[PDB]
Structures are given as structure tokens and as C-alpha cells.
Amino acid sequence: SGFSKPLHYPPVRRDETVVDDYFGVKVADPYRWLEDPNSEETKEFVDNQEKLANSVLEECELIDKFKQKIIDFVNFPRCGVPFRRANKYFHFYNSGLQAQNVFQMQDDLDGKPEVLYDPNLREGGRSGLSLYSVSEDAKYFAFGIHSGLTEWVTIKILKTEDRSYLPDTLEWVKFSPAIWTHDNKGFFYCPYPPLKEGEDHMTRSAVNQEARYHFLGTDQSEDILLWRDLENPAHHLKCQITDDGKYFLLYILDGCDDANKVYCLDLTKLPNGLESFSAPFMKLIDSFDASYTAIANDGSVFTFQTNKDAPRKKLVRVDLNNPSVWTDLVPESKKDLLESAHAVNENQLILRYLSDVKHVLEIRDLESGALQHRLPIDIGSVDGITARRRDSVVFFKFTSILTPGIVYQCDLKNDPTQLKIFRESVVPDFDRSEFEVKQVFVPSKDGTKIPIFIAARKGISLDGSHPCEMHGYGGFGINMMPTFSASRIVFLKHLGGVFCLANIRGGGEYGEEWHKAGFRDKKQNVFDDFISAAEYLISSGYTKARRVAIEGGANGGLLVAACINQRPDLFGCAEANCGVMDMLRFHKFTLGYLWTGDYGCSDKEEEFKWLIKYSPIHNVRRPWEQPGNEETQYPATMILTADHDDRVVPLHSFKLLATMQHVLCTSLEDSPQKNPIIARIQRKAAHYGRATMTQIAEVADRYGFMAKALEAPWID
């Protein structure tokens, strides 16, 4: 059976004086001290919770069996999508179990690879490459490494001919690319201001993002300033250069929304190069009314993707010399989201549509916009189209729940109809034919139909006997696709599991209307959709309440925590990874203020009223005290986080853990809460980008805990 040994919950201090006023409503915050990650009391907390977690995970006898089977199932070579610069080709490679992917160069696609950068030779591959950019002549490679334990990036540059490093070093980058000019003299990038003497990446909320240009062979102090906005510190940036080299495009965003400005700088009409310097941008779009991404241009005639009066998106054309006259090229589809578009083979477009959460590729003529070919893709995901306008061969990656990884090739000149296999990964000693994935559409509370994928062994009986894992996210316009996971295969084969992915609202799957129906005032819809999916899996006979586990990361960790506060009776196991748990204070830490588009903010009265109803740490309540459900407790719960997660600060997880342990376990002398409530805190790690073995160790612990919580035996 499951968990039988009682837990020795450690003492955690409460400061009872901390109370905040939100428009007349008082909120006590007695674990305010856990907001300091560098203090001695917080480090002791982490030590005590590690100790408790170890004794619980010692009781979970299947961890070692999961660990070895995950290692074995992921031990296959993985070739990335290749891209071209001049007469060279570039790609990422992993031979199967390397700590981080290696970046390689070739003369031809079937030639001998040459290693350009191997992260495994630095600190055992603790961290990998988060930025990688090759110049137009293929002579230089700009690459981003992690100098500390947070996700902050340092940019270095090497010569491709001998791999010699240039001395140039650029600090203070997060998500920016490095965008080369066609003269090969430098690149655009978008850094934040430096850390001052006292400051720490874990406790500073960085603002005032900048657009800069770096000349090769200079110090970072010489980099040219192109844009800054001191009166709007929260406005953040992306950038791009056009295929012809003529225009630098700066996109300006406010919060998480899919709405951006478009500023264009004509590089061919500068008196003194970029050394002339804000710069004289043409402000094509100067408000936050719609999304705009540049796809192609012929001189000043541009082709944009946009959601302007088009929640499923479309393609439109405009002349910069006549800026107010926009004309449709490919109208909005009546059914399907236009997810992305790419110019190829000089005068053609590849369009990627999402049609009931399955991709469809259309080949079109660029000038007229007319359909030429249509290729439906199987259950799974196409992405990573990086080919540029001048290329006649397009590459992209395909993944699915039962398909580890194919790089496809579409030669547009020689045969544009079908797709050829360039590279194909294979899972060792795994018979794919014994399993299936199906889509079903389930009604939510309000009637809205929610697509879900269900993966399982073929021919199982729908008798309620199977353990079930359900995954979801529901936020920021993100599309959740059924991709490959090795640990999920172990769950299906060796634990007899049923996996479900739920395409709940707040994602982008049916366009901007789907996103808006699960954000701000309607965030509760997201939780209702997830709860309804679990109720369908029960009523249709896949599983029952004791046997359902739910998992999610970040905004998906919020999802899990809210669902266990509201319907603890439905679940047997809950796993929240790096979740946003204090919805009253999230906006104050690091770059959490960028989530106010989706969540709202407690600075405003009507928005506070949304947030207080579902904020995880403010809604922990003993389920057995509600008349009628005296035999209900919280499911076995694992809260996962990392000590240098600067994306979602670990105070979110620390404060929830302490509140749950207090309210449900240590505040009562003989609690009905028997199921364990623990944290697994990864030392010396950030949000993402961890070494292969470090991530395998976390995932084996999750699944061993799940197996115990659900009372699922191993199957050989």
C-alpha cells in the first residue's frame, strides 16, 4: 500500500505581526521572512525540508527502477534542425546522455561534423548554450553561457576557422538574441542595466531594458545606445533584421500580451554607419492594439503576420512610403489559428496552421498569396522552421508522444509535395505499436468543449482500475502540444498508466478568444476546464479519484495548487514544479511584473478581488471541516523548486509549503491529514537548462513518489 510511516514535520517560525491592507481587506503574511533566499533562517528551512523529503523518498521503493529505465529510454542520438550561413551548415547534437548539447559545423549536410563549442568541458556541463548566433559570412559564432547559478547570460564570440576566442565579453542579457548586420562588423542585442555593487540577480527587479549595437573588437562600454524609455520602465523588447540586410526592426511590448509596437530603422540611409549615435526610427505601429511580426519585404513593401481584427491571425501587406494603407494577403481562416509564417525559395511561403491542436502546413505563392500544396501532420508537433528566404530546402522537427524525433526535409524546387526523412531518432527496446494516442472533446462546466489527448496501451478495459497522470498549463497564449517524453513512456509501459494532456483555455489553441477566456477576470475558467477533464476521465472509466495524479510547471504549478485547494477529493497525487503561489506579491520580484497582462495586479482594487479568490497561499483550508466531506484530505503533494530560480522566485514554493504544513498538519494535535506534504528543492540550479542527469534525478523522484501515492505496482 501507500504511505504508512508518520512524518516528523520540522518547526517553522511564524512572525504574527506582518499584516497588509488591500483596499480595506487585511491579509496576514507570517512567512514574509522566507522571501530572503540568502538568510541563515531560510537556508536552515531548506535543510530541514531536504531532510524530511529524504525520509519520505526512502519509503518509495521504485525510484531506482524508474531512474535506470529513464536513462535507458533516453540513450539515443539527437540531431537538431540544421541552418545555413554562406557555404557552411550548423546544428546542435547530443550522442544520447551528454549533460548538454554540443554545437557543430559542416561543409556539406553529409560531411564530417566539427565541434565549435562543447559545454560538457566546462564545469561538467552544469549549464548549456542559451544563445547561439552565426554571422552572415559564417566566420564568427556569438554564444551565450551562464557565468553564475541564475539564468542570466554572458555573450562570448569565437572564430569558426580555428575556434579561437575573441576577447569581447557582453554581460546583462536574459532573452535577447544576437542579430548580425550583413557587413559582419557587429550585432544588435537588447540588455538590461548592470548590477550595482550591493545587488543580486535573485533579489533585484530589473527594469529599463535597452537596444544596443556591439562592434567586434571593442569593450561593452563602447556599445551604441539605440533605444531606452525611462518613463515606461516595464516596456520590454524583441528585435530582428530583414533578410536583405536593409532594416533593423525593434518590437516593443508591455506585459505578457500578444500586442506589440513596430519601429523600423533604415540602415542604408545613415550618414556615418551606426556610429552616428535615440536613432531615427519610423514608428509604423506606435500602440498596443495588435500583434505584428515581419515575414518578408521587397524594398519598402512589407508582409506582416497580425491579429489585428483577426483573433486567429492573418497575413497583411503595407508600403512604408504609404504607411496607413494595409491590405490582406492571406485572409483569416474561419476555423484555424495561423501560428507562424516563413518566406522560402525566394517567392514562396510556408504557413503553419493549428487545426484542433494538430499542425497543417500550407505552401503558398508570396506575391499573390494563393494556395499551392497542403500537407496534414499526424498527432504531434512541427516546429523549428529556421530556413531563410534565399534557401530552396526547408528543414523542420517533428515530435510526438510515441515518436522521439524526426528532422524532415522539404525540397521546394525538386519535389515540393512530400516530406523526406533527413534524421530519425529511435527509442531503444521500445515497441511503439503496443500504444495509441487519441483526441476527445469534453464539455467544461459552462459547456465549452475542451480538447484532450489520451495516451494508453491498446485494448485496455475502461473499468476505473488504471493510474492516470494529467498535464496542463492554461496561460499566456501558449499552445500545449503532445511532444515526446522518455519518462512518460516508462509510466505507460512499466506502471500501466494512462497519460492525458488537456488543452484548457488561457492557451492560444483556438486563437486570442481562447486566451482571453482564461485570463484576468476569467482565470477561474482555466481551473474549471482542468477539473472537468479529470471528471471525464473518471466517469468514462479510465480511472478513479484515488488514482489521478496532476502535474504542471510555473503557470502550470499555479494550476495544480489552485485545483488541490478547490477539489482535493479528486486527486491522489499533486506535483507543482516552480509554481507561482503568492498572487498578491508576484509582481514585486525579478521580472514577475511581466505577468500582469495575464493575471492583473493587486495594486488595483477590482484585480485584487479576482486574485484573492484563487491565490494558492491564501486559500489553504482543512477539507474535513466542511460538513459532508469529513473523510477528505489533501492528496500526497510534492512541491518542486530550485534555489536559484530567478524566473519564478523560490519564495513562492517555500511560502506555500510552510502554509500547507501549518494549516493541515502542525496547527492540530491529531490531524486527519495522513498523506505527505513535502518539497524537493534542487540545489545550485535555475528554472530550466539543467544537465541531463540532474533532470533525470528530479523526474525519477517525482514518479517514485507518484507510484507510492497512487498505490501502483511496477510491471516488468
Partner: peptide, 14 residues
């Protein structure tokens, strides 16, 4: 977008 409460060249599809 890159800047969200979201977990995404990962070393392995674990």
C-alpha cells in the same frame, strides 16, 4: 514569448 512563467535546446527529452 520567452519571458513567461513557463518551462521550455534542452539537453534531453526527459
Amino acid at each position: 514569448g520567452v519571458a513567461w512563467a513557463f518551462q521550455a535546446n534542452a539537453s534531453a527529452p526527459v
